[PDB]
Design a protein around this ligand. Structure first.
Ligand SMILES: Nc1ncnc2c1ncn2[C@@H]1O[C@H](COP(=O)(O)OP(=O)(O)OP(O)(O)=S)[C@@H](O)[C@H]1O
Ligand SMILES: Nc1ncnc2c1ncn2[C@@H]1O[C@H](COP(=O)(O)OP(=O)(O)OP(O)(O)=S)[C@@H](O)[C@H]1O
Ligand SMILES: Nc1nc2c(ncn2[C@@H]2O[C@H](COP(=O)(O)OP(=O)(O)O)[C@@H](O)[C@H]2O)c(=O)[nH]1
Ligand SMILES: [Mg+2]
Ligand SMILES: [Mg+2]
Lengths: 352, 159, 327, 332, 258, 257
DNA sequence: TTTCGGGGGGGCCGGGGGG
DNA sequence: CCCCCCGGCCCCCCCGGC
């Protein structure tokens, strides 16, 4: 197994960064019978899902890690057949309704309600065979839910609080509607510090018997990850595999293919500002989008790569960031992402 | 109080082609057709309340005299006009045998034909073509583009 | 039409083209002589243009006009043609070619071809016109540039309006079903950008590439979802994180070994797959995602056939775990 | 009970338990004797007590037993298409009122009509509301309607005309302090002076958020087990409020006016997970109430903050919006 | 090594059909004692238990207990093609990736032998330790099916109350309410249809209409069905087999008002 | 209870309801000491159904004070389908009732089925619509009327009934052709049930819709004969006589224009 | 391509009636 | 007791501006 997954902590006591958050989670788990609905918001790859699983393991037993995948049927008003993959344990269910796009509402109105409106049979650890505890539902990528699904969650959260408790995870609370935020206890999940990332990487290296010339290499990996611990671990593994498990001070930092393509697009845009350049940029954007690269990620990375160009002056950067804001709003409210990306590229080309 | 009076729009609806105002050339052409018979397949188009239904009804009445009851098949949006209706009832009416003066034919009046679906219009084509020796078709519509091109090719355009 | 696809290569296709006026002038002369009405040969071509080469229509026109008019001369040809002129809905290529023409956007051309006419031209096909405009608005030589305005500025303005039109379209096809905004969309997606970059086409008009790219993206997203839910029990991320972070390391642990130790990596690779409930089809799908300098097509092709055959035999001769039963 | 969150545990049980909605609760209590309850349209910001108020009104109108057969509740979790409105709602509105028992008649007012509560009505389509218009008008004799929403503009004008409007005011430290203090006392929560006022200021009109924050602070204090009063510092920390030192650092970087420094600082800042809305609100408070700025500067910054907040409300990227706002402010 | 030669294969077909809707992947433990199965539903609100004793089979023997993760849909596919009157046998081997189902008949020509793939399902040590059920009863399966079908049209929830000489079934819906109250009934001419009731403490429980409909759908196994209700434990719906039984544990609806 | 009416078998009530369930949706029953009088109107407001059931039809009937129950026919049919046809059927209602209770009791066993159907608020009057002196009144076996209606409906959607001295004419004109059936009064002592009688004051001629007549003929299962009363400027009355009651259909003729 | 609603048209299924 | 007629769901597909 990959080192990122093989060394993931499985308990609150096993956490290694953000000790204050660990103490807060322990306080919340001390008396879980009245735990409110939780909404963990924070940067990607920081450990939000790890901390949610640790909290569940603190509330219930280790059995929370005995997961299984099932497939649930759904029928729309037009009789369309939809499948939803549900990860479940003897104590909780995990769902990602956004997998069904605009149909996510149905999952909220049919599946979740069904969980909250009935009791469950528990033939292990219970003498009577009936569960004497509330069931936990984790909603992944809660920020991807449509407004209809979020609205449907509202009364379900309140009516059946005795039987169901919700734990949602998100990278940004901006798409969450105000009532849902009001109904949840908000938990901020800060990214680990550079020293903590270096400590984790050093522990992994020691466990894997990887030869390291200097610890600074780990530090160099930590900055390149921009606080993303998953990216840090995966990059460490890639670097080790690319140097026969022997890393040196000259070991280059590996970047993913899509990032390289975006950097090349930035260079092309800066160098050439014309309609033919725009057509080539459109081709590159189509290629990036066709391979499951989200449009928002493309816009963010392109904007920051452009702002990192040394030859641009302050006026150009101000115009670029303003256009990025405008077209991020456009993307949030649109269907065809390529249209907005092309518009942003054209505006940037005009400004330069 | 409980006895309604006929509105002037219906009370003074023109009953003869000479009582219709406007579109002098087309009205005179319709009068000539009525006098000499041999009515062709026609599509009358325009905007609301200009005298399309009145003109079609007056032409049919003048042409068919007392044979109006048997020689005219009137269908509009208020009646079912699906593909099955076109294939069965309209086809039977076209295939019907009726005795009329030498210069007259049976008339099918599809008022508000723009509401008909594409399939019914397609089904009407060969029915119009094969039975033209005894049946003629008059469409009245508000938007000519709704009528498919094959039907327009078979008719005379009166805008 | 797509409905006629099954008849592609199971019949001899015989095409009939609109007959020219010279091929029917004698017939019209014979009909006019027999029916006792004067028909000037000069105006015959105008009549054919009116009906767009429909002999049935032109004969019907002659029959209808001869009832009261006994002479079709140059004097009355204009009125008759304008009364009987056909209205054929243009196809997407014709719509794109006409909308991007710079003449219609000039003052005089605006007087002849009006804004209502442009909106009707869009409505001739309201599901493909915006796509065609978005596809072809970057491949013209504008003749409507304002004093000092460059081609790039007009292109940027057109792109901004296309983005606004996309937002309007999202509004239209929402749960509210706001189809009353269809006219507005026509202006924002087709008419305004075309007016901004109207002129002469620099090259061949191309059909929209958005549909094929959208279908390809949907297919790749489906493959990504299957791969993610096959490995969901071992990883900690969403599908996007799997695409952006995990797949490079998975390649380094699944593809690179075959390029260094040849057939000695097989077992190791299999082990990795067994650790994540992966399969051969997932292997190929994962190898099909990378772009830029990480394209594997040539790399996979260059692998010796013996190594791939051995990998297939080893996989097919061993039992593997199942993450999801009855997917 | 001990197995319920404080928000649900302390939900009002009767109209007298509503804290700061007297302008409407008085009329609702009057209707008990008047027995001519009109069609109601409750609207207001989140967590003001609309659902609690309607539930308490039904409780006091029909009592625990007769309520089930007299109330029809539909919310966003239920399908409410035009067909549903035209069939199910119409059929329920056409039914005769259930017969009260002797107990109910002698112990409760038992008005001669039933109630349909369409909670979160702003999520319903316009066609469904149009269908509801004449259904409410025709059967007013035996049925009354309650529409609860957050955005009143989403209700079609005919329905708003048919309904009597009730605006639920925002709950702040001035009108809701008593309820929070009562909850804290009943829970034996030890807090320093001004802690409850600070909680209500942070909640910004939402009493549910304030109660949840109080419960979180109480849990933290109990886990600590130090027997010390809860301070405002941990209350601010639990609410996600940025520390004042960080805000001053951001203000200084903005005053510097260098694009690169601002970009680097914002990149470092976004790694802490602070929500963009809280940062924007704190910046607005700092700048608008500062005496070291001219009228023109405040005039421009108010519009800049309004634009940034409107963009953020659409679910945009927090990093880009915050960087754009800070860059624009630095150039004022 | 392992075989369960049946008196009539139709019995096995009905047994498999009786719980196909509730569960689809169930582990069957074949021992010399018989066939055992215990599967929890996907929603963790219903449990299906199956027991087929050695006596029921015409000729059953086992040399080593074997757990087969046979799929129910594939088993139904195998059994549907079989003839009306056969002697289904379940032969397997030491390392079975498939089990050969021999559909043998008295005649040497009416044979429908097939093969059925076996899946690898994970099985846990489910415990069904007996509990002091408050009140139990047994009534003909046809009557239960009629009651459930009639009451489902009214509402999706059905309430069962056991009181002194009273078995109350209630279905309250939007259009109205229905009740089919029955009392202890004994027939001397045909005791087989008599209603049996042993009541210890009062019980009132609400169940989902869909689950009850699914349970009664598999009532062809026996002309009688037994219901055991405990105030603090899930109900139990039992259909006696020739030498075992098919049992269902259903979790009652959460009582929000309580 | 306020009202308690017992049917020896639920079959009779089921057949009575099935006689007019396909033409109307909402019905209002007024129960008094003399029996039950019910009225219903179709959606198009073209047909009116009036049912009367006397006390003689019930094994035991008791109604202390008049009570009005407004119900929806499809729900009533759905409820009735849940009870067996061989069980005694008791209709029970209370003062100012909110629901009607249907009790299906099987004396053979201890099976009792209680079904509560919620009433709907319907404030309407019966108007006791019955013209005093109709222009013409005839009666004939229900089978003949049903056969004639079925035969003529196949040709046209409209059927014309003309009554003249010793002549009853049913005419239909359609696209494929026309049909005409002429019947004269006749009496047979051997089988009087097959006789048709007519009494005419003025000649009559009225056009009706075929669909409504097709719905009306469904009542032939309740009576062997049918009586038709026709008058100009008044709706046509089709009556089927029951053992101790009646079923009447008032059908408005089409406008002559 | 497509997030509802309406409309049209075809294929079954099954109640009832007839022989 | 079996076969045929013809009402009702059930499903699939296609517009939706002036
Ligand atoms: N040319 C006309 N001369 C006299 N009366 C007319 C004329 N046109 C319309 N009317 C009057 O308006 C009434 C309606 O005329 P119609 O023939 O129904 O118009 P229409 O164009 O067919 O309406 P549409 O296209 O179905 S909305 C007639 O009864 C006449 O009384
Ligand atoms: N006026 C109030 N008085 C007392 N408690 C209140 C009041 N308003 C809100 N609360 C508290 O917050 C909780 C939620 O109140 P709600 O009635 O759900 O507010 P709401 O306005 O209906 O929320 P929305 O509009 O659906 S986001 C209650 O259980 C109370 O504990
Ligand atoms: N040693 C250590 N690793 C952690 C910790 N938290 C997260 N990680 C690692 O970081 C990886 C990503 O964490 P994850 O929760 O999936 O990211 P998120 O859900 O996007 O916030 C995990 O696979 C862990 O290996 C921690 O507290 N200690
Ligand atoms: Mg007209
Ligand atoms: Mg509320």
């Amino acid at each position: 197994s990959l080192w990122v997954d093989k060394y993931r902590p499985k308990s609150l006591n096993a956490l290694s960064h953000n000790e204050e958050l660990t103490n807060f989670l322990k306080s919340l788990s001390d008396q879980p019978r009245d735990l409110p609905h939780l909404l963990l918001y924070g940067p990607n790859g920081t450990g939000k899902k790890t901390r949610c699983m640790a909290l569940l393991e603190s509330i219930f037993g280790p059995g929370v890690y005995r997961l299984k995948i099932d497939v649930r049927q759904f029928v729309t008003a037009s009789n369309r057949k939809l499948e939803l993959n549900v990860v479940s344990s003897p104590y909780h269910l995990e769902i990602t309704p956004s997998d069904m796009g605009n149909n996510d509402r149905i999952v909220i109105q049919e599946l979740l309600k069904e969980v909250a409106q009935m009791e469950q049979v528990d033939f292990q650890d219970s003498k009577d065979g009936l569960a004497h505890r509330y069931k936990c539902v984790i909603i992944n990528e809660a920020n991807s839910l449509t407004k209809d699904a979020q609205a449907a969650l509202r009364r379900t959260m309140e009516k059946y609080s005795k039987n169901i408790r919700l734990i949602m995870v998100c990278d940004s609370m901006s798409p969450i509607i105000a009532p849902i935020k009001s109904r949840c206890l908000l938990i901020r999940c800060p990214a680990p510090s550079d020293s903590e990332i270096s400590t984790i990487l050093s522990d992994v290296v020691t466990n894997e018997r990887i030869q390291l010339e200097t610890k600074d290499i780990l530090k160099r990996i930590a900055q390149a990850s921009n606080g993303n611990l998953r990216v840090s671990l995966l990059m460490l593994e890639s670097m080790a595999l690319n140097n026969e498990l022997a890393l040196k001070s000259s070991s280059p930092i590996i970047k993913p293919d899509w990032i390289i393509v975006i950097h090349k697009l930035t260079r092309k845009i800066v160098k050439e500002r014309s309609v033919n350049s725009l057509i080539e940029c459109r081709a590159v954007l189509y290629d990036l989008l066709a391979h499951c690269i989200p449009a928002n990620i493309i816009l963010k990375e392109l904007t920051f790569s452009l702002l990192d160009v040394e030859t641009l002056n302050t006026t150009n950067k101000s115009s670029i960031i303003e256009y990025s804001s405008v077209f991020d709003e456009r993307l949030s409210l649109g269907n065809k992402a390529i249209f907005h990306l092309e518009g942003f590229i054209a505006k940037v080309m005009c400004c330069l | 109080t409980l006895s309604l009076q006929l509105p002037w729009v219906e009370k003074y609806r023109p009953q003869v082609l000479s009582d219709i105002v406007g579109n002098k050339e087309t009205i005179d052409r319709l009068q000539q057709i009525a006098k000499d018979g041999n009515m062709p397949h026609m599509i009358i188009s325009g905007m609301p309340g200009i005298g399309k239904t009145t003109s079609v009804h007056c032409l049919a009445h003048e042409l068919l005299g007392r044979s109006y009851a048997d020689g005219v098949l009137e269908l509009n949006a208020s009646d079912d006009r699906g593909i099955d209706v076109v294939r069965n009832q309209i086809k039977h009416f076209a295939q019907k045998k009726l005795h009329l003066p030498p210069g007259k034919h049976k008339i099918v009046i599809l008022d508000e034909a723009d509401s008909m679906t594409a399939g019914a219009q397609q089904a009407l084509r060969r029915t119009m073509e094969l039975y033209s020796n005894s049946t003629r078709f008059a469409f009245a519509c508000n938007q000519s583009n709704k009528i498919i091109e094959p039907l327009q090719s078979r008719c005379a355009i009166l805008r | 039409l797509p409905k006629m696809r099954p008849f592609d290569r199971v019949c001899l296709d015989i095409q009939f083209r609109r007959p020219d006026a010279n091929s029917i002038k004698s017939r019209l002369m014979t009909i006019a002589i027999r029916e006792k009405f004067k028909l000037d040969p000069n105006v015959i071509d105008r009549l054919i243009q009116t009906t767009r080469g429909d002999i049935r229509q032109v004969i019907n026109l002659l029959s209808t006009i001869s009832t009261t008019t006994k002479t079709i001369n140059h004097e009355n040809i204009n009125e008759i043609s304008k009364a009987w002129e056909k209205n054929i809905a243009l196809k997407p290529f014709d719509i794109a070619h006409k909308m991007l023409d710079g003449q219609i956007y000039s003052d005089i051309g605006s007087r002849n071809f009006t804004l209502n006419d442009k909106i009707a031209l869009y409505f001739d096909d309201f599901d493909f016109t915006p796509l065609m405009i978005q596809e072809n608005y970057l491949s013209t030589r504008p003749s409507v540039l304002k004093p000092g305005q460059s081609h790039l500025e007009a292109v940027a303005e057109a792109a901004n309006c296309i983005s606004l039109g996309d937002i309007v379209e999202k509004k239209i096809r929402s749960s509210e079903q706001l189809w009353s905004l269809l006219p507005l969309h026509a202006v924002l997606s087709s008419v305004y950008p075309a007016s901004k970059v109207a002129g002469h086409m620099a090259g061949r008009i191309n059909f929209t590439a958005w549909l094929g790219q959208n279908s390809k993206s949907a297919k790749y997203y489906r493959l990504l979802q299957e791969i993610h839910y096959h490995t969901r029990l071992g990883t900690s991320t969403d599908k996007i994180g799997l695409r952006l972070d995990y797949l490079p390391t998975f390649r380094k642990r699944l593809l690179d070994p075959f390029l260094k130790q040849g057939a000695d990596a097989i077992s190791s690779v299999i082990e990795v797959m067994d650790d994540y409930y992966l399969t051969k089809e997932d292997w190929d799908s994962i190898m099909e995602f990378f772009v830029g300098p990480d394209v594997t097509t040539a790399i996979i092709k260059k692998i010796p056939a013996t190594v791939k055959s051995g990998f297939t035999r080893k996989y097919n001769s061993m039992t593997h775990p199942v993450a999801i039963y009855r997917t | 009970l001990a197995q319920q969150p404080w928000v649900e545990k302390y939900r009002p049980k009767n109209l007298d338990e509503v804290t700061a909605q007297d302008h409407a609760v008085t009329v609702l209590k009057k209707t008990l004797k008047s027995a001519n309850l009109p069609h109601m349209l409750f609207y207001g910001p989140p967590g003001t007590g609309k659902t609690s108020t309607i539930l308490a009104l039904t409780k006091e109108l029909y009592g625990p037993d007769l309520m089930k057969s007299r109330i029809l509740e539909l919310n966003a979790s239920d399908e409410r298409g035009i067909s549903i409105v035209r069939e199910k709602v119409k059929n329920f509105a056409r039914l005769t009122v259930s017969k009260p028992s002797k107990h109910d008649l002698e112990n409760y007012p038992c008005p001669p009509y039933k109630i349909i509560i369409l909670d979160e009505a702003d999520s319903m389509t316009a066609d469904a509301q149009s269908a509801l218009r004449r259904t409410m008008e025709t059967y007013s004799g035996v049925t009354r309607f309650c529409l609860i929403c957050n955005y009143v503009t989403r209700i079609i004008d005919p329905l708003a005309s048919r309904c009597s409007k009730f605006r639920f005011k925002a709950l702040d430290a001035s009108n809701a302090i008593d309820r929070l203090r009562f909850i804290s006392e009943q829970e034996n929560v030890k807090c320093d002076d001004g802690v409850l006022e600070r909680i209500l200021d942070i909640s910004a009109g939402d009493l549910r958020r304030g109660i949840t924050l109080l419960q979180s602070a109480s849990k933290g204090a109990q886990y600590l087990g130090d027997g010390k009063n809860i301070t405002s510092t941990q209350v601010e920390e639990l609410a996600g409020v940025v520390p004042h030192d960080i805000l001053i650092e951001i203000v200084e970087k903005v005053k510097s006016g260098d694009f690169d420094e601002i970009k680097k600082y914002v990149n470092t800042f976004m790694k802490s997970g602070w929500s963009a809305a809280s940062v924007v609100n704190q910046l607005h408070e700092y700048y608008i109430t500062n005496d070291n700025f001219d009228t023109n500067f405040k005039n421009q910054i108010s519009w800049l903050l309004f634009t940034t907040d409107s963009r953020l409300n659409n679910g945009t990227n927090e990093h880009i919006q915050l960087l754009n706002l800070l860059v624009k402010i630095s150039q004022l | 090594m392992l075989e369960a030669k049946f008196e009539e294969a139709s019995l096995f077909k009905r047994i498999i059909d009786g719980f196909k809707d509730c569960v689809q992947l169930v582990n069957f433990q074949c021992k010399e004692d018989g066939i055992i199965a215990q599967a929890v539903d996907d929603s963790r609100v219903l449990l299906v238990s199956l027991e087929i004793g050695v006596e029921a089979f015409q000729e059953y023997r086992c040399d080593h207990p074997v757990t087969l993760g046979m799929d129910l849909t594939s088993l139904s596919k195998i059994l549907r093609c079989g003839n009306n009157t056969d002697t289904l046998t379940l032969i397997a081997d030491n390392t079975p990736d498939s089990i050969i189902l021999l559909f043998e008949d008295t005649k040497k020509d009416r044979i429908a032998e097939y093969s059925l793939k076996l899946m690898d399902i994970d099985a846990d040590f489910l415990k069904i330790e007996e509990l002091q059920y408050d009140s139990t009863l047994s009534l003909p399966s046809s009557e239960f099916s009629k009651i459930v079908r009639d009451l489902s049209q009214l509402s999706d929830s059905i309430n069962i109350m056991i009181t002194k000489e009273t078995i109350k079934f209630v279905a309250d819906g939007d259009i109205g309410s229905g009740s089919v109250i029955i009392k202890p009934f004994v027939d001397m001419e045909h005791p087989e249809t008599s209603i049996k009731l042993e009541m210890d403490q009062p019980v009132d429980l609400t169940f989902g209409a869909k689950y009850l409909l699914d349970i009664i759908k598999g009532s062809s196994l026996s002309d009688r069905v037994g219901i055991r209700l405990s105030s603090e434990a899930p109900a139990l719906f039992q259909f006696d087999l020739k030498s075992g039984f098919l049992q269902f544990f259903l979790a009652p609806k959460f009582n929000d008002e309580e």
